[PDB]
Amino acid sequence: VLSPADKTNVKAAWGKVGAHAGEYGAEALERMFLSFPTTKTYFPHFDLSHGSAQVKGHGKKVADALTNAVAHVDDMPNALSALSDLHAHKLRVDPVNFKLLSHCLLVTLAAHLPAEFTPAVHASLDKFLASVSTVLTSKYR
């Protein structure tokens, strides 16, 4: 459960991301593909090569949904219904994978928002990605 401090921390951090979220989305995927190659099983149809437009595009898509989640941090379940659906009934990604992308997302923010990636902000973003993960896998069964 996201505390008010957490919600603040997150909105702040994401606030700084700004026009780069798409690039950070893309970078997080690339880091996930290389560090946890088992995650690639879900993208057989993609060109997973560095700088692929498929990866870039997908990076944006993910980034955008996170934004929308920060924006509706108070009503995630509702803001992400559709996405929760897609993942549970179409994509069917195994839940273990959400933790892997979440981690690559922290790493990416850390590497790009040094000043902002304080210990308290790290804790908050983590909880946040965790909550987002829970929402996305809530209708799995």
């Binding site: 190659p37 088992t38 099983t41 069917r92 195994d94 994978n97």
Partner: protein, 146 residues
């Protein structure tokens, strides 16, 4: 694969009593029912809409038998699982694109299946031997992912 001799005899004694045709069907069926997300690999199997539709699907039964078939062979080469499973690991990765976590879910379901079937005979210590075994097989099946 740290199977003590006594753990290995235990695995082998029990495996003696298994009807792989049957266990294979149950394990796979139950996987598709407990973790419905795993159904992503079987859209060509037909109707998996309910437990009965899954457990009884001729396609699921036949596939289960195949899978446990390969697993049984693995049990005769406990010393060289990676070797035993290498072409299969490549296939699952490169052709089937099966997330290896699937191999661990099946191992847990299989353990429940053995418990179900052997009752009291599946003692705490026998379970621990089988736990090492399904983990070894899952690891062997994932060794060639890249």
């Amino acid at each position: 694969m740290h199977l003590t001799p006594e753990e290995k005899s235990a695995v082998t004694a029990l495996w003696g009593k298994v009807n792989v045709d049957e266990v294979g069907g149950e394990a796979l069926g139950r996987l598709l029912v407990v973790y419905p997300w795993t159904q992503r690999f079987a859209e060509s199997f037909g109707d998996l809409s309910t437990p009965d539709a899954v457990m009884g699907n001729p396609k699921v039964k036949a596939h289960g038998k195949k899978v446990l078939g390969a697993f049984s062979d693995g049990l005769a080469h406990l010393d060289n699982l990676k070797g035993t499973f290498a072409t299969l690991s490549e296939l699952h990765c490169d052709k089937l694109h099966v997330d290896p976590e699937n191999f661990r879910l099946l191992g847990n379901v299989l353990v429940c299946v053995l418990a179900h079937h052997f009752g009291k005979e599946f003692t705490p210590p026998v379970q621990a031997a089988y736990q090492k075994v399904v983990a070894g097989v899952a690891n062997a099946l994932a060794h060639k992912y890249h």
